[PDB]
Design an enzyme around this catalytic site. Structure first.
Site, PDB file in Angstrom:
ATOM      1  N   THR H   1      -0.943  -3.153   5.303  1.00 31.92           N
ATOM      2  CA  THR H   1      -0.457  -4.412   5.861  1.00 31.92           C
ATOM      3  C   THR H   1       0.266  -5.145   4.717  1.00 31.92           C
ATOM      4  OG1 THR H   1      -2.488  -4.685   7.220  1.00 31.92           O
ATOM      5  CG2 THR H   1      -1.026  -6.476   7.137  1.00 31.92           C
ATOM      6  N   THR H   2      -0.215  -6.300   4.289  1.00 27.22           N
ATOM      7  CA  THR H   2       0.197  -6.994   3.118  1.00 27.22           C
ATOM      8  C   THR H   2      -0.489  -6.382   1.984  1.00 27.22           C
ATOM      9  OG1 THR H   2      -1.474  -8.749   3.259  1.00 27.22           O
ATOM     10  CG2 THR H   2       0.655  -9.189   4.379  1.00 27.22           C
ATOM     11  N   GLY H 171       2.915  -1.951   5.539  1.00 30.60           N
ATOM     12  CA  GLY H 171       3.657  -2.784   4.624  1.00 30.60           C
ATOM     13  C   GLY H 171       5.083  -2.698   5.070  1.00 30.60           C
TER      14      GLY H 171
END
Lengths: 245, 196, 216, 219, 234, 246, 249, 202, 205
Positions: H1-2, H171
């Site tokens: 993700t982040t 990401g």
């Protein structure tokens, strides 16, 4: 008259023409009946020196309760009506207890004093409960803002001091503190200093026969509020005796 | 199946009502001789039919409540009002963890709106009509009232219709002929009619 | 009989009680499931000047307990000038909390070992996830209780309390065995001792290695 | 279904939606607003469930009118947004309201997205509903970061129009609500690319073919 | 004992049969700023003396003619705290109303609901009444409204009335000059004159605020806009 | 005598006096004269400036630790004027009100709204039969990010009025009159100007003129996203400038 | 007594007998007359409004006579400020009754619900006693058209003709005297209502600014309650007026 | 993700955050601004799922906003970090996500707390959490040497943060780097139209 | 109307605009699944008998809600001159259904009434909980929306003659019943004027 002792204190829901209710002014008188509590601030802690009035020599520790442990870095030395002394101890302490749980860190004294001061004034407003009528000091060593000393009087006023004394010999004592140095020096040098001020101020028209109690809250005791050891107490006292004479 | 048998035949003023005594728990009749037909007053009678617990609990409460209204107004509770009143009660109760649902019949004579007889459904749907049954029997009892009378024939012939319906109670469902509690409720009060 | 699937675990808290001191070793590693996120981690806390607390199993459940024991200790010291709290009241009241939270079926275990002296007696108390309080000669909770504690029991069986030297050899033996047998942990331990002044135990450092059975 | 998208100009928000509010794919209404009107300078775009979407906008509509009137200054997006956030977390989520909050504030203009429990952040393009993704594409083609009001208008028309041809549920007329520094333009039929409740002929019954057996007239 | 305890309380009744308390509250409003409200029947005007004198007042977010909702404003006299709670509750109640009907509240329903609230303090003991008399203006349904709600918690219908400093003299001028149905612009001119009777020390470059309620809606007006009307008739 | 009348309930439990204003409220103003803290606040276009006596009677007190400037929002600041017992209680109360609001609204508070809201809370204290109104005045400073710098003042009972320039204290009437001339002949503002004007008017009324460790000047400038206390370093610089200025 | 032990209702009388209620009765007399007369197709209420002033906004025609329910209306004699909480309370009770019973609410039932709140305020809770007497007018199918009188204390009675306000003693006897039973009609009870209202009141003229008149009339078996508007009121006044005028010099 | 990471200096700290929230295969929001602020001396960085992470951080807004008021001007990190961790344990079911809180306290000038989704704070040289940071987990610690100066944290962080999102399947989209000191926070932007990614494998 | 649960009611609703009125046509059935005890049960109700709310799901909350809406109606009419607008009425039912957030009720509100202040016939339906839909053509609504909706689009223009509209709506419902099993007995129609509600009762099954 600047106060009336019957009329405008019949309820705690009153004000007076000057602007300040008479009950609060009486509450300063309540503190006058008892002995003096001095507490001088270092930058490595605070050291208290309270003279404890005695009537018997069957008294042991945890008697009169001049020193209370508000926290594991907050100390309290009190002066005035011992009855009143227990509730003020609760008020500061409960605020501390909620704080510790939630925030998770050592309390800054700058916040505590105003926060407590609100509560002390809050009884005065109410006629559910009467004003307080003992005076206390908060002295703390923390990494949060350093060593800091505040005094909160039963009105609910909080002010900063490097040296405060509350008693019936508060005016005479405060001037005496200003002449000495203790502002920058360690708690170990200071303890000796807190004792001597009590002996020199000690009058026979403001106080009676006493046994000395002094207290730490600084780097030597590793934050925490403890009473000074008997051996140490007696050297701090030995200077206190010499200094009067 | 919904609940055990009930058959009720309104005449045209009178209403003749019957329920079995048989209040059975586990596989025996615990009671077999008591009426679960309640006198909420003398001018109004309510007859509550359903499960074992909801019948006694809802009506005993209602009864004490009926009396309280009577003192207040100093006139018998109004019949029209009683018909809407029983609908609010059974909807409110219905959510409770112990299940309340009643197949009810209110019979009263009032000096106000008049006579009322109330058909009331298991979906807490209020209707006045003439011919009612209790259990999955409501379909069985309403049906013989539609064909054989225009629901204005004598109470005596209605009893004969009732005997025939009770014979169904032996056949389709489980209940035995042994005891049924029979009461006819009119303006005066309740009259005890013969057991079957 | 229970053991929730732990996420952030401290696997082992070692403990042996001696004459005025306790020696505790506390695992440096903080496993957050399989990944070892943080080593630096001391799980032994300083409540007050004569008490200490060391816990193994979930670390989150620990951090919730350290502030709570902090407010209980803060109420008790107020009453004296230097009064300090005894081990047993704080540990037993927490026991009642864990017995209740165990019954609530989604929960996470922690098992703590308290050392204090607030009485006229040095108390070694435990509150467990299951709950109970007892005295123990040598103690270990959680993953220690399962596998080393039995080795400790073996020792305890003919010789009721071991010597200083023998406890050190065992410690050294033990860390090897945990890395080898259990997962999450590491060899890395912090040595923490509590005494009448507070708790002293510096940062967790590496100690003897052997994940070799090539040599066996 | 319910497909609302909004895009961001310096004034604040240009909101675009198609008309026709649907119960699955079946019409409750053939032509009505999906982008909803809150007081003045604050507007709300809508996605996901229609019904849940209406009550979330309407509650903020009351709180915003309140905050602006007491203060006697603008409305704040962060204000409605947070007020919603605290109620729904306490509830434990039941939202099916994707709302696109857009307001002109005292200092910077502030644009927000409300999912079920809220998120407090400043987006720059927001699209709500299950067709959120499908809305973003036209914007990705004809809008680069920060444009003029006229350009912004075209992007809203364009995002509604790509959904109209390609989707069968993208159906009907494009409604635009331009809310800027202090004005609210509700241009109904910005473009009607299909006519609302069309009829070319109809077939109705002939004198009384309907069942009856009683009639009364209560007053 | 004496009359002192009995008469003052609102924990028990005045022995007069009417409460000496609400009368006290009106005296408060007399010590307040002078306020006039007049329904023209083309719109409503609320005007008050606002202390600038050098422009010592923020007029960018704080005013004396203040909006409750879109088309309702209030102008006030008397105790300042009592009013602030009254405003905030009043707007809250209005917003509940705008939420539900989708129409901002009219003056005539609002005063009655507002009166229920002010009555509660006039009932409760230890709790004093609200010491503000409100002039409520509005335009809803195509008709302008002006109502007076007194500190007792009652509402009265007026076409034009006066509050604040020398209210007796205000009410006498209003009856005398005012005619049913007038123009909103002529109406401001007599309102500025109504204030001028018991202004105190007279108007500087601008030491009044006026707000108008009309067809387009209630708006408080800017110090410049306000000044134009004052030249015509001081 | 004095304002109001003792007769009946109005100090036993709070029920109006003949004046229609509470007995306690009229007395409430007198409470500022008890305090001895005389304040003037002046509003710039680059900052809002408040200047007050810090009331340090001796250097035995620590000048830093003693304060009357409080940080009540994220950059809204205030000063306390009047009876000190009332003043700390108001500060702490204002702080609760402040935090709640910041969250709800979601951004830093307008100076106007904060003063309005405390003004509503103080009515509560007035109305309740156990309690009595506050005797203090909170003077809020802050820069609204629309309108610009705003200086508000709330009265003891909880009166609210708008202000672009204000003074409060013992000598309230005199301080507002010196500032009134300055507002009329309005200078263009900068950090330095606004501060110089606030101090100068307060120093004419008192006729002593301040020490550089006995006043506390508090600003909310555009350059700080925090509420900042000027301290002895900054104040000393403005003070030597005053003598020379005119 | 020699001193009351009242000054609160959280403390009580030095006799245990409540003086405040007798002052409340006097309070109805201070305020303008309220009268109710019975009819054989309706019931009507006539009340003197607080406002006598020429300048009236007149958005309300209900400012002392409030229509509560779809079967009942009440009037106020006493303080206006008190009605506002009461009137909203009465609306809640009145609809509350319908929800359970769904019957044309009887006048005796609505009044007993209200009397519970008034008796509690006088006993405790520190709330000052009421100073309004309210007249409830309604229709039920079990006795007919009814009129009830409620007192500040919680004291109630069913009447079919009653008057309170502008010296109660005189007024109730007079209202009775001129009342007839079973000879009545709605128009004639209304013409008579103004006449009696005129005599108890100091004014010998009376206008729709001074007075507000309500009907409760049953049409097609259902009760329609309206408080009348000013032009309609004036017509009942002018009907009376010719007679009043002959009395005068 | 982040990806969130916080790197230590000699007594300052450098934070790293990326923007993106994915709803399974379709990315619902990438527009999202997941570097907010909370104070001028304390900051927290948001990541994880946007709905869940926001509520916990927001309960922390309201508690944290009380803590700045009470105190003298500059806020304590230590107060704020406690509320966030405590929120994730209680409300583990309801609210999940892992916040990275970094700035200066009032007791020192270099504190990094992590209140995790599993819950537990420790201060260390480097820790990374949230989505793709797990992957670069050993990697934040090695790649920058512990407690190295500002310019060197800036080269290491900016290159590495471009490479975290590349390797991260969930990401993607602008890497936002922040170096925080005292009262002044500086942020830099590494685009998403410019690679700076570390040797991609076959 | 905060009614819930579409089985154990027997509800279907259609509203159409006439040209001097709006008429709302409904079934008058009773059911528990499909098991009943009477011909008629009331589902459209008169809230003043000149403005009506027709609530569809359970009978219990239909009557209760009606009376609570009546509590609001009377205060509003007392407070400000001339009886409520349809615009006001339509949003007031929307607000009542709305308040329920946590595990929301599903009622199908039909609001039918003329603007009483100044003429403006309006008919409205809302979906789910509520989202506003204004209709002027003919609209059918229920959880079996589809049966009414196909037919609703079919007969009108946007305003066929009141007599004609009446006959068409009643018929759309009589033929529906053979298509469904939530409907038997009686079709109830309310044509809503400002002084008469013309009520027609269709044949019984």
């Amino acid at each position: 008259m600047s106060s009336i002792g019957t009329g405008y204190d019949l309820s705690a829901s009153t004000f007076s023409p000057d602007g300040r209710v008479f009950q609060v002014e009486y509450a300063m008188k309540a503190v006058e009946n008892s002995s003096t509590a001095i507490g001088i601030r270092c930058k490595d802690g605070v050291v208290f020196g309270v003279e404890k009035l005695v009537l018997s020599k069957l008294y042991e520790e945890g008697s009169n309760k001049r020193l209370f442990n508000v926290d594991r870095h907050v100390g309290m030395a009190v002066a005035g009506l011992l009855a009143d002394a227990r509730s003020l101890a609760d008020i500061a302490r409960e605020e501390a207890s909620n704080f510790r749980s939630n925030f998770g860190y050592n309390i800054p004294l700058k916040h505590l004093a105003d926060r407590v001061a609100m509560y002390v004034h809050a009884y005065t407003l109410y006629s559910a409960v009467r004003p307080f009528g003992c005076s206390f000091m908060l002295g703390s060593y923390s990494v949060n803002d350093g060593a800091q000393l505040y005094m909160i009087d039963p009105s609910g006023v909080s002010y900063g001091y490097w040296g405060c004394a509350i008693g019936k010999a508060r005016q005479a004592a405060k001037t005496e503190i200003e002449k000495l140095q203790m502002k920058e020096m360690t708690c170990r040098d200071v303890v000796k200093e807190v004792a001597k001020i009590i002996y020199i101020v000690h009058d026979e028209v403001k106080d009676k026969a006493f046994e000395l109690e002094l207290s730490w809250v600084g780097e030597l005791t590793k934050g925490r509020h403890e009473i000074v050891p008997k051996d140490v107490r007696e050297e701090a006292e030995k200077y206190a005796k010499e200094s009067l004479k | 199946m919904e609940y055990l048998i009930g058959i009720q035949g309104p005449d045209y003023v009178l209403v003749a009502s019957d329920r079995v005594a048989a209040s059975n728990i586990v596989q025996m009749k615990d009671d077999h001789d008591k009426m679960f037909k309640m006198s909420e007053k003398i001018l109004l009678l309510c007859v509550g039919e359903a499960g074992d617990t909801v019948q006694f609990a809802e009506y005993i409460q209602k009864n004490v409540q009926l009396y309280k209204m009577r003192n207040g107004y100093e006139l018998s509770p109004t019949a029209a009002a009683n018909f809407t009143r029983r609908n609010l009660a059974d909807c409110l109760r219905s959510r409770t963890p112990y299940h309340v649902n009643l197949l009810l019949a209110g019979y009263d004579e009032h000096e106000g709106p008049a006579l009322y007889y109330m058909d009331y459904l298991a979906a807490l749907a209020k209707a006045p009509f003439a011919a009612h049954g209790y259990g999955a029997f409501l379909t069985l009892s309403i049906l013989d009232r539609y064909y054989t009378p225009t629901i204005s024939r004598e109470r005596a012939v209605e009893l004969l219709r009732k005997c025939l319906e009770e014979l169904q109670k032996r056949f389709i469902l489980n209940l035995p002929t042994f005891s049924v509690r029979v009461i006819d409720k009119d303006g005066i009060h309740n009259l005890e009619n013969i057991t079957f | 009989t229970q053991n929730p699937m732990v996420t952030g675990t401290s696997v082992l808290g070692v403990k042996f009680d001696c004459g005025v001191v306790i020696a505790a070793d506390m695992l440096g590693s903080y496993g957050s499931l399989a990944r070892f996120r943080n080593i630096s981690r001391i799980m032994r806390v300083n409540d007050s000047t004569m008490l200490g607390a060391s816990g193994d199993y979930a670390d989150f459940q620990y951090l919730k307990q350290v502030l709570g024991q902090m407010v209980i200790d803060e109420e008790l010291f107020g009453d004296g000038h230097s009064y300090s709290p005894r081990a047993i009241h704080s540990w037993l009241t927490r026991a009642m909390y864990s017995r209740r939270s165990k019954m609530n079926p989604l929960w996470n275990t922690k098992v703590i070992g308290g050392y204090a002296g607030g009485e006229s007696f040095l108390g070694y108390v435990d509150m467990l996830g299951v709950a109970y309080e007892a005295p123990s000669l040598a103690t270990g909770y959680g993953a220690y209780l399962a596998q080393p504690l039995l080795r400790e029991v073996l020792e305890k069986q003919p010789v009721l309390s071991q010597t200083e030297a023998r406890e050190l050899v065992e410690r050294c033996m033990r860390v090897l065995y945990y890395r080898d047998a259990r997962s999450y942990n590491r060899f890395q331990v912090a040595t923490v001792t509590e005494k009448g002044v507070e708790i002293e135990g510096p940062l967790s450092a590496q100690t003897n290695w052997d994940i070799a059975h090539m040599i066996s | 279904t319910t497909i609302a998208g909004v895009v961001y100009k310096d004034g604040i928000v240009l909101g675009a939606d198609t008309r026709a509010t649907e119960g699955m794919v079946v019409a409750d209404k053939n032509c009505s607003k999906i982008h909803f009107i809150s007081p003045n300078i604050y507007c709300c775009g809508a996605g996901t469930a229609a019904d849940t979407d209406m009550t979330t906008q309407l509650i903020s509509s009351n709180l915003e009118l309140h905050s602006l009137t007491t203060g006697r200054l603008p409305r704040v997006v962060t204000a409605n947004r947070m007020l919603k956030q605290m109620l729904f977390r306490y509830q434990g989520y039941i939202g099916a309201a994707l709302v696109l909050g857009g307001v002109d504030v005292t200092g910077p203009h502030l644009y927000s997205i409300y999912p079920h429990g809220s998120t407090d952040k400043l987006p720059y393009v927001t699209m709500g509903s299950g067709s959120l993704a499908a809305m973003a594409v036209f914007e990705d083609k004809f809008r680069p970061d920060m444009e003029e009001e006229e350009a912004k208008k075209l992007v809203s028309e364009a995002i509604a129009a790509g959904i109209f041809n390609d989707l069968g549920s993208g159906s009907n007329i494009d409604l635009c609500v331009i809310s800027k520094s202090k004005l609210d333009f509700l241009r109904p039929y910005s473009v009607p690319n299909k006519k609302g409740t069309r009829f070319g002929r109809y077939r109705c019954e002939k004198g009384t073919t309907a069942v009856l057996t009683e009639k009364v007239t209560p007053l | 004992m004496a009359e002192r305890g009995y008469s003052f309380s609102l924990t028990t009744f005045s022995p007069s049969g009417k409460l000496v308390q609400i009368e006290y509250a009106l005296a408060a409003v007399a010590g307040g700023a002078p306020s006039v409200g007049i329904k023209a029947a083309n719109g409503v005007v609320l005007a008050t003396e606002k202390k600038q004198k050098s422009i010592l007042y923020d007029e960018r977010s704080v005013h004396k003619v203040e909006p409750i909702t879109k088309h309702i404003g209030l102008v006030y006299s008397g105790m300042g705290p009592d009013y602030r709670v009254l405003v905030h509750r009043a707007r809250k109640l209005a917003q509940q109303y705008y939420l539900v009907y989708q129409e901002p509240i009219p003056t005539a329903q609002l005063v009655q609901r507002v009166a229920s609230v002010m009555q509660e303090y006039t009932q409760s003991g230890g709790v004093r009444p609200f010491g503000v008399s409100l002039l409520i203006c509005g335009w809803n349904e195509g008709r302008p409204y002006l109502f007076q709600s007194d500190p007792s918690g009652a509402y009265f219908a007026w076409k034009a009335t006066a509050m604040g400093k020398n209210y007796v003299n205000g009410k006498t001028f209003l009856e005398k000059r005012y005619n049913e149905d007038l123009e909103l612009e002529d109406a401001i001119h007599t309102a500025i004159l109504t204030l001028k009777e018991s202004f105190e020390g007279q108007m500087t470059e601008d030491n009044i605020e006026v707000g108008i309620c009309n067809e387009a809606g209630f708006r408080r007006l800017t110090p410049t806009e306000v000044r134009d009307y004052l030249a015509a008739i001081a | 005598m004095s304002r109001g009348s003792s007769a009946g309930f109005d100090r036993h439990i709070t029920i109006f006096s003949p004046e229609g204003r509470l007995y306690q409220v009229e007395y409430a103003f007198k409470a500022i004269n008890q305090g001895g803290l005389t304040s003037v606040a002046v509003r710039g276009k680059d900052c809002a400036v408040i200047v007050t006596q810090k009331k340090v009677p001796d250097k035995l007190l620590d000048s830093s630790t003693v304060t009357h400037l409080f940080k009540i929002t994220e950059n809204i600041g205030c000063v306390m004027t009047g009876m000190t017992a009332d003043s700390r209680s108001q500060v702490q109360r204002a702080r609760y009100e402040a935090a709640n609001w910041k969250y709800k609204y979601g951004y830093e508070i307008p100076v106007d709204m904060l003063c309005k809201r405390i003004a509503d809370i103080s009515q509560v204290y007035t109305q309740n039969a156990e309690m009595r109104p506050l005797g203090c005045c909170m003077i809020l400073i802050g820069i609204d990010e629309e309108q610009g710098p705003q200086v508000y003042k709330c009265d003891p009972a909880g009166y609210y009025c708008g202000f672009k320039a204000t003074a409060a204290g013992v000598k309230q009437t005199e301080s507002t009159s010196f500032l009134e001339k300055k507002v009329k002949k309005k200078f263009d503002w900068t950090f330095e100007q606004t501060v110089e004007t606030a101090i100068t008017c307060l120093s004419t009324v008192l006729s002593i003129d301040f020490k550089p460790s006995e006043i506390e000047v508090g600003v909310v400038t555009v350059e700080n996203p925090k509420f900042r206390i000027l301290t002895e370093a900054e104040i000393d610089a403005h003070l030597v400038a005053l003598a020379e200025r005119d | 007594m020699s001193r009351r032990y009242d000054s609160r209702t959280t403390i009580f009388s030095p006799e245990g007998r409540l003086y405040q209620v007798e002052y409340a009765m006097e309070a109805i007399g201070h305020a303008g007359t309220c009268l109710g007369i019975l009819a054989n197709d309706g019931v009507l209420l006539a009340a003197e409004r607080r406002n006598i002033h020429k300048l009236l906004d007149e958005v309300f025609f209900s400012e002392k006579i409030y229509k509560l329910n779809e079967d009942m209306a009440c009037s106020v004699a006493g303080i206006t400020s008190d009605a506002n909480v009461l009137t909203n309370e009465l609306r809640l009770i009145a609809q509350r009754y319908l929800l359970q019973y769904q019957e044309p609410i009887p006048c005796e039932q609505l009044v007993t619900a209200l009397c519970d709140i008034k008796q509690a305020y006088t006993q405790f809770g520190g709330k000052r006693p009421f100073g309004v007497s309210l007249l409830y007018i309604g229709w039920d199918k079990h006795y007919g058209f009814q009129l009830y009188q409620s007192d500040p204390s919680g004291n109630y009675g069913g009447w079919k003709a009653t008057c309170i306000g502008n010296n109660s003693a005189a007024a109730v006897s007079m209202l009775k005297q001129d009342y007839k039973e079973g000879e009545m009609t709605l128009k004639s009870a209304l013409a008579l209502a103004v006449k009696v209202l005129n005599k108890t009141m100091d004014v010998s003229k009376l206008s729709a600014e001074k007075v507000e008149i309500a009907t409760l009339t049953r049409e097609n078996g259902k009760t329609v309650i309206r408080v009348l508007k000013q032009k309609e009121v004036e017509q009942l006044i002018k009907k009376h007026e010719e007679e009043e005028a002959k009395a005068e010099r | 993700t982040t990806i969130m990471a916080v790197q230590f200096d000699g007594g300052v700290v450098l934070g790293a955050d990326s923007r993106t929230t994915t709803g399974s295969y379709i990315a619902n929001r990438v527009t999202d601004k997941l570097t907010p602020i909370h104070d001028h001396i304390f900051c927290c960085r948001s990541g994880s799922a946007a709905d869940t992470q926001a509520v916990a951080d927001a309960v922390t807004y309201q508690l944290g906003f009380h803590s700045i008021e009470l105190n003298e001007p500059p806020l304590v990190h230590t107060a704020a970090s406690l509320f966030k961790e405590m929120c994730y344990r209680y409300r583990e079911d309801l609210m999940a996500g892992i916040i990275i809180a970094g700035w200066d306290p009032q007791e020192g000038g270099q504190v990094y707390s992590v209140p995790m989704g599993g819950m537990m704070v420790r201060q260390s040289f480097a820790i990374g959490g949230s989505g793709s940071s797990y992957i670069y987990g050993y990697v934040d610690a090695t790649y920058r040497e512990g407690m190295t100066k500002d310019e060197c944290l800036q080269f290491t962080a900016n290159a590495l943060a471009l490479a975290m999102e590349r390797d991260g399947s969930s990401g993607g989209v602008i890497r936002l780097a922040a170096i925080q000191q005292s009262g002044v926070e500086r942020q830099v932007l590494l685009g998403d139209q410019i690679p700076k990614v570390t040797i991609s494998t076959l | 109307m905060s009614v819930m649960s579409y089985n154990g009611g027997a509800v279907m609703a259609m509203k159409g605009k006439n040209c001097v009125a709006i008429a709302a046509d409904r079934r008058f059935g009773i059911q528990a699944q499909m098991v009943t005890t009477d011909f008629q049960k009331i589902f459209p109700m008169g809230d003043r008998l000149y403005i009506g709310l027709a609530g569809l799901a359970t009978d219990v909350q239909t009557v209760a809600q009606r009376l609570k809406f009546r509590l609001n109606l009377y205060e509003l009419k007392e407070g400000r001159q001339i009886k409520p607008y349809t615009l006001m009425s339509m949003v007031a039912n929307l607000l009542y259904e709305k308040r329920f957030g946590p595990y929301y009720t599903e009622p199908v509100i039909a609001g039918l009434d003329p603007k009483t202040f100044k003429p403006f016939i309006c008919s409205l339906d809302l979906i789910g909980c509520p989202m506003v839909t204004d209709d002027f053509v003919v609209s059918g609504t229920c959880s079996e929306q589809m049966y009414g909706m196909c037919e609703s689009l079919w007969e009108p223009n946007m305003d066929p003659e009141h007599l004609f509209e009446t006959i068409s709506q009643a018929m759309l419902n009589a033929v529906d019943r053979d298509a469904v099993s939530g409907m038997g007995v009686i079709v109830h129609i309310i044509e809503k004027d400002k002084i008469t509600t013309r009520t027609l009762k269709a044949r019984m099954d």
